[PDB]
Design an enzyme around this catalytic site. Structure first.
Site, PDB file in Angstrom:
ATOM      1  N   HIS A  87       3.616  42.424 105.668  1.00 61.09           N
ATOM      2  CA  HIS A  87       3.352  42.301 107.112  1.00 61.09           C
ATOM      3  C   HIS A  87       2.835  40.897 107.473  1.00 61.09           C
ATOM      4  O   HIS A  87       2.816  40.561 108.649  1.00 61.09           O
ATOM      5  CB  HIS A  87       2.332  43.338 107.550  1.00 61.09           C
TER       6      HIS A  87
ATOM      7  N   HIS B 283       8.072  56.305  99.612  1.00 60.42           N
ATOM      8  CA  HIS B 283       7.492  55.357  98.634  1.00 60.42           C
ATOM      9  C   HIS B 283       6.079  54.972  99.092  1.00 60.42           C
ATOM     10  O   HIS B 283       5.177  54.846  98.230  1.00 60.42           O
ATOM     11  CB  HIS B 283       8.386  54.133  98.477  1.00 60.42           C
TER      12      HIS B 283
ATOM     13  N   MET C 270       2.772  53.251  97.220  1.00 61.90           N
ATOM     14  CA  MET C 270       3.295  51.872  97.102  1.00 61.90           C
ATOM     15  C   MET C 270       2.864  51.055  98.317  1.00 61.90           C
ATOM     16  O   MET C 270       3.705  50.665  99.164  1.00 61.90           O
ATOM     17  CB  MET C 270       4.817  51.834  96.933  1.00 61.90           C
TER      18      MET C 270
ATOM     19  N   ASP D 242       7.704  44.568 101.353  1.00 63.33           N
ATOM     20  CA  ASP D 242       7.628  44.141 102.777  1.00 63.33           C
ATOM     21  C   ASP D 242       6.188  43.681 102.992  1.00 63.33           C
ATOM     22  O   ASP D 242       5.272  44.507 102.913  1.00 63.33           O
ATOM     23  CB  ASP D 242       7.948  45.305 103.712  1.00 63.33           C
TER      24      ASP D 242
ATOM     25  N   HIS E 285       3.868  46.769 101.497  1.00 66.51           N
ATOM     26  CA  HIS E 285       4.321  48.103 101.034  1.00 66.51           C
ATOM     27  C   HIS E 285       5.794  48.053 100.628  1.00 66.51           C
ATOM     28  O   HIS E 285       6.526  47.153 101.110  1.00 66.51           O
ATOM     29  CB  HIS E 285       4.013  49.184 102.079  1.00 66.51           C
ATOM     30  N   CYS E 286       6.183  49.046  99.844  1.00 65.89           N
ATOM     31  CA  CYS E 286       7.593  49.261  99.477  1.00 65.89           C
ATOM     32  C   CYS E 286       8.308  49.846 100.704  1.00 65.89           C
ATOM     33  O   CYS E 286       7.668  50.533 101.500  1.00 65.89           O
ATOM     34  CB  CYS E 286       7.610  50.173  98.268  1.00 65.89           C
TER      35      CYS E 286
ATOM     36  N   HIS F 175      13.106  49.866  94.153  1.00 65.32           N
ATOM     37  CA  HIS F 175      11.894  49.464  94.905  1.00 65.32           C
ATOM     38  C   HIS F 175      12.109  48.092  95.519  1.00 65.32           C
ATOM     39  O   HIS F 175      12.974  47.299  95.083  1.00 65.32           O
ATOM     40  CB  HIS F 175      10.655  49.429  93.993  1.00 65.32           C
TER      41      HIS F 175
ATOM     42  N   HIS G 249     -14.529  58.450 109.589  1.00 64.28           N
ATOM     43  CA  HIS G 249     -15.391  59.357 110.389  1.00 64.28           C
ATOM     44  C   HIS G 249     -14.618  60.476 111.063  1.00 64.28           C
ATOM     45  O   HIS G 249     -15.123  61.068 112.026  1.00 64.28           O
ATOM     46  CB  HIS G 249     -16.323  58.570 111.308  1.00 64.28           C
TER      47      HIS G 249
ATOM     48  N   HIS H 144     -16.609  53.951 108.779  1.00 68.11           N
ATOM     49  CA  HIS H 144     -18.029  53.981 109.164  1.00 68.11           C
ATOM     50  C   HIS H 144     -18.849  53.782 107.878  1.00 68.11           C
ATOM     51  O   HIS H 144     -18.619  54.489 106.891  1.00 68.11           O
ATOM     52  CB  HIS H 144     -18.376  55.304 109.841  1.00 68.11           C
TER      53      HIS H 144
ATOM     54  N   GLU I 246     -20.523  50.744 115.273  1.00 62.20           N
ATOM     55  CA  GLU I 246     -20.894  51.909 114.451  1.00 62.20           C
ATOM     56  C   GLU I 246     -19.701  52.333 113.603  1.00 62.20           C
ATOM     57  O   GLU I 246     -19.858  52.615 112.416  1.00 62.20           O
ATOM     58  CB  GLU I 246     -21.441  53.076 115.296  1.00 62.20           C
ATOM     59  N   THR I 247     -18.546  52.433 114.254  1.00 61.74           N
ATOM     60  CA  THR I 247     -17.300  52.942 113.651  1.00 61.74           C
ATOM     61  C   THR I 247     -16.170  52.092 114.199  1.00 61.74           C
ATOM     62  O   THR I 247     -16.216  51.733 115.385  1.00 61.74           O
ATOM     63  CB  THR I 247     -17.115  54.421 114.022  1.00 61.74           C
TER      64      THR I 247
HETATM   65  O1  LIG Z   1     -23.056  58.906 109.897  1.00 56.95           O
HETATM   66  N1  LIG Z   1     -21.905  59.333 109.434  1.00 56.95           N
HETATM   67  O2  LIG Z   1     -21.348  60.465 109.054  1.00 56.95           O
HETATM   68  O1  LIG Z   2       6.862  46.886 107.700  1.00 64.00           O
HETATM   69  N1  LIG Z   2       6.970  48.077 108.239  1.00 64.00           N
HETATM   70  O2  LIG Z   2       7.309  49.300 107.880  1.00 64.00           O
HETATM   71 CU   LIG Z   3       9.168  51.869  96.004  1.00 63.65          CU
HETATM   72 CU   LIG Z   4     -21.834  59.648 111.183  1.00 62.10          CU
HETATM   73 CU   LIG Z   5       5.369  48.075 107.465  1.00 68.57          CU
END
Ligand SMILES: O=N[O-]
Ligand SMILES: O=N[O-]
Ligand SMILES: [Cu+2]
Ligand SMILES: [Cu+2]
Ligand SMILES: [Cu+2]
Ligand SMILES: OC[C@H]1O[C@@](CO)(O[C@H]2O[C@H](CO)[C@@H](O)[C@H](O)[C@H]2O)[C@@H](O)[C@@H]1O
Ligand SMILES: OC[C@H]1O[C@@](CO)(O[C@H]2O[C@H](CO)[C@@H](O)[C@H](O)[C@H]2O)[C@@H](O)[C@@H]1O
Ligand SMILES: OC[C@H]1O[C@@](CO)(O[C@H]2O[C@H](CO)[C@@H](O)[C@H](O)[C@H]2O)[C@@H](O)[C@@H]1O
Ligand SMILES: OC[C@H]1O[C@@](CO)(O[C@H]2O[C@H](CO)[C@@H](O)[C@H](O)[C@H]2O)[C@@H](O)[C@@H]1O
Ligand SMILES: OC[C@H]1O[C@@](CO)(O[C@H]2O[C@H](CO)[C@@H](O)[C@H](O)[C@H]2O)[C@@H](O)[C@@H]1O
Ligand SMILES: OC[C@H]1O[C@@](CO)(O[C@H]2O[C@H](CO)[C@@H](O)[C@H](O)[C@H]2O)[C@@H](O)[C@@H]1O
Ligand SMILES: O=N[O-]
Ligand SMILES: [Cu+2]
Ligand SMILES: [Cu+2]
Ligand SMILES: [Cu+2]
Lengths: 345, 345, 345
Positions: free
Chosen positions: A92, A138, A143, A90, A127-128, A87, A299, A248, A272-273
């Site tokens: 970001h 992974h 992960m 990373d 993440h891994c 493992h 949603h 949402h 809303e979303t």
């Molecule tokens: O209002 N959302 O499903």
């Molecule tokens: O960090 N990217 O897979």
């Molecule tokens: Cu891993």
């Molecule tokens: Cu909705």
């Molecule tokens: Cu990444």
């Protein structure tokens, strides 16, 4: 020769978040975190389906890490000898060496220590990523988590006004790829290595069997609903390391939303979303105005209701009939409005 | 009666870009381009799978065209008599006649000349669109590229500061729909017309068999990695004519990102991952701060690692240990931190 | 005890919109609407495929409701006794009680009256949401529409300039999940309840069989093309209650686009393609500059051309050769430019 004060952080299991300051007058620190890899079989739905999960700190998602701009983050990554695979990690949030992946590859029985400077504000996926096809495997085995880098003055609205949350929750969304047998029943395995070939075939068709928050269908419903009160400003951090999502809050809004997740950008207002691009984290502030149950979903309502992707908030307080009221409860359709009703007929 | 100076442009094969000025003191010109359609069998993955491609200028993507706001773009589109199908071109940068599609339909053995005014700044898709079901089929067979319309003063940050790139790369992402036989093996055909019926069945299920940059899995890895140096500001133009993508530079960021691709809008700052809506181009600036290998992916990591969608940058320079360092190389887990490690156990 | 003037609105069938003011000097009103649920078999493609639809007011989408910020919206929801299922309504524009769903559940033979305050500006989805797996099933059976909450001063560009539309159209996009038999033919049923089990199996694989505007393939093509004239500013409201979309006006642009749909946010300028997140509405303004046919699509061109998701505008006016012209009509490729043509060969 990095000559700064050191501060251990004790992580907690999502959807909760370790204690931290929003605005701070502390200067830069070396913020010390430990993540322990755990491979283990986990229950992922309400029918008791299991799968061979891989985790940071025994949870999906991994825990939320919180630091401030200009802090250094020193992560001890541990891969216990009870694990079967290599493992790594990373970030970001970090600059160089594939986010740290290229400096953190560890076999079972090993640990490694990575330091990265928090030069970029926002919420970010970690993440891994061990290399090649093991990267998606992974990540979709669980992960992945997130780190939040707050500005030292805390959040703002992009227009010179301070924003403060009363509560914070971290919602990690996980797409899962569980093999089925010829009859359609989910298959079980004795190890992640045994599950791999069949799981990669499902992964290749890009359609998850499950989409879950906090690691399983129903993980944030019933007894484990998220609490809030009318008047509280709540920060909802949402991450998805591999696949898009569209959050949402049913009966609410996003008052301030950073859907790309980066606090150098002004938030959008009154959504809303919103949209979490696969491989990112975003965040929404909402001030609750009404008590009651609120569902929090992606949603795509098929994913929300049928594949596992619903959380609940239980909000205490007094109902505001000015915002919404039931003017007339369900009743018999008169007669007498027939012609009216039109009409499209 | 359009009374402007004419300037031929010689296009080059992606991921490179023809020579151009960013800021210019030249006035409006008639910028002359030629695109030649080529239907040909092409290798699209590392196992040597072939498919019946359709291209502008023999490449997937077609080449990047670069002009300035207020230029007129005069495109000679050529359909050689060795081709089997009609073709045309639709510029998302252009106004009227379905982007030019309705004025450029040509049979094998014909050419046509279209002029459009560059009234809209940004990066834009161009693609073939002959009509009806042939529109998606020509696009997902590889007939798509991009055009960049720069402001005459060059790029800016939306806050009155000039942005200049040292290098530019064009990453065209292609979703492919390759038929399989009953055993799961990819099928080969002697012509695009013979491949059509089986390919349309795959297209209808909306799940690509391959997702590739510059026309094939591994096309921008190894020997063909993208070069840069620490300190260089690099513009990465990303297009997808049919399907969404979520670009990510592993170990980097998007310093300035126009994910909807249009330079009248201020860029977002410090993104981890951005979003190219199917049918668009976007662009990200990044100033490299660390040497080494950087993967550039769509952050559906299944598509990146298993369906072909990974490019590499090889960046020369000196490592900055302030930004990131390996504090301790992989070592044996002590004993003595067992109880500590917790804890989730 | 809500002491405001009341105003009935008569809704009209999409893609048209009931009469309304953009800017208004009226104060807050109680705006009265009625929606009648209709379950009915409907034709959804050009081959005459039918499916067991559920609708608000007999249409997919349900009709667009238009009000102003600070209005109260009083909705009578009617569920006729000829219907077979319970129904309710959730306004993404409203605050509390799951958007109103938790106050509007009605059996066949019942009606209910809900009031919500229009505190949030923008375009918003409304949809049925009876609970659990019935939520996605009622939505993807057609029970969704949209409401627009205009600022009292009308639209603006986010930079202090008023924006006014000459025409408004509402495009509701619907993902459909029609079961197939062993030979691949679409299956027919005598009731929505009989279709449910087979439909849920299709829904679970997240790949629609049809993607349509205004309820069926070809619903806004030919005779039912959308009219406009050169010089008219047209507002195109786009909603998708369950699934992402990427709108594009072929041969045009989005001059001002609110892709997240909320008028407290400044619009983006000059887009080629925008993005409607599943569970939302967005809106684009465009001033037509050229006459002729314009296709309006989701720019997954497979969905647009092969699954039903194309509308047409027919625009009257005079052609502008400065913006675009055919310099030379299709002709024989000379000889004499062979060597030139290159070159990639
Ligand atoms: O209002 N959302 O499903
Ligand atoms: O960090 N990217 O897979
Ligand atoms: Cu891993
Ligand atoms: Cu909705
Ligand atoms: Cu990444
Ligand atoms: O070229 C940078 C490349 O090397 C890594 C090791 O995986 O970081 C190292 O960079 C140099 C090695 O050539 C050293 O100066 C430094 O000590 C070391 O950390 C990667 O981080 C990077 O991708
Ligand atoms: O989905 C296929 C088919 O398989 C069965 C069992 O044969 O159910 C499986 O799939 C369901 C949907 O994922 C799950 O609800 C269940 O856990 C699983 O065994 C059938 O019931 C279904 O028709
Ligand atoms: O109505 C515009 C429509 O026509 C096209 C031809 O495909 O452009 C033409 O427009 C007029 C023809 O009726 C002429 O004035 C002009 O000469 C010609 O280019 C399309 O571009 C457009 O969709
Ligand atoms: O994916 C189905 C199945 O087909 C086989 C060959 O029978 O492999 C094909 O598909 C693979 C995944 O796309 C490719 O790696 C290979 O090029 C192709 O022949 C099996 O190996 C696989 O189980
Ligand atoms: O706790 C709020 C919860 O109740 C609902 C009913 O579904 O609204 C009600 O709220 C109170 C009931 O406990 C009453 O004061 C009020 O009369 C009533 O409308 C939901 O709207 C909400 O989710
Ligand atoms: O798509 C599968 C397969 O089914 C058939 C009929 O057996 O066509 C059906 O599916 C088509 C694509 O959706 C439709 O065009 C048609 O309405 C439907 O019967 C075959 O023609 C096709 O190969
Ligand atoms: O230009 N659109 O397909
Ligand atoms: Cu073509
Ligand atoms: Cu297009
Ligand atoms: Cu319903």
């Amino acid at each position: 020769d990095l000559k700064l004060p050191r501060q251990r952080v004790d992580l907690v299991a999502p959807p909760f978040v370790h204690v931290h300051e929003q605005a701070t007058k502390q200067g830069p620190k070396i913020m010390e975190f430990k993540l322990v890899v755990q491979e283990k079989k986990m229950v992922i739905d309400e029918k008791g389906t299991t799968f061979q999960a891989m985790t940071f700190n025994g949870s999906m998602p991994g825990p939320l890490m919180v630091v401030h701009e200009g802090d250094y983050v020193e992560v001890t990554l541990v891969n216990p000898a009870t694990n079967t695979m290599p493992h790594n990690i990373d970030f970001h949030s970090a600059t160089g060496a594939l986010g740290g992946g290229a400096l953190t590859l560890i076999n079972p029985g090993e640990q490694v220590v990575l330091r990265w400077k928090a030069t970029r504000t926002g919420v970010f996926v970690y993440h891994c990523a061990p290399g090649g096809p093991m990267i998606p495997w992974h990540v979709v085995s669980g992960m992945n988590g997130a780190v939040m880098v707050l500005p030292r003055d805390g959040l703002n609205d992009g227009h010179g006004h301070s924003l403060r949350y009363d509560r914070i929750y971290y919602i990690g969304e996980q797409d899962l790829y569980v093999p089925r047998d010829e009859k359609g029943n989910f298959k079980s395995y004795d190890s992640p290595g045994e599950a791999y070939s069949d799981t990669e075939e499902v992964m290749r068709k890009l359609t998850p069997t499950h989409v879950v928050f906090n690691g399983k269908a129903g993980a944030l419903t019933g007894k484990n609903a998220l609490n809030a009160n009318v008047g509280e400003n709540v920060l909802i951090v949402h991450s998805q390391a591999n696949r898009d999502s569209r959050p949402h809050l049913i009966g609410g809004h996003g008052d301030y939303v950073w859907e790309t997740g980066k606090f150098s950008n002004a938030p959008e207002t009154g959504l809303e979303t919103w949209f979490i691009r696969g491989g990112s984290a975003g965040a929404a502030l909402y001030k609750f105005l009404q008590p009651g149950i609120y569902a929090y979903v992606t949603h795509n309502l098929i994913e929300a209701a049928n594949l596992g992707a619903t959380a609940h908030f239980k909000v205490e307080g007094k109902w505001n009939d000015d915002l919404m009221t039931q003017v007339k409860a369900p009743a018999d359709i008169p007669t007498g409005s027939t012609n009216e009703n039109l009409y499209f007929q």
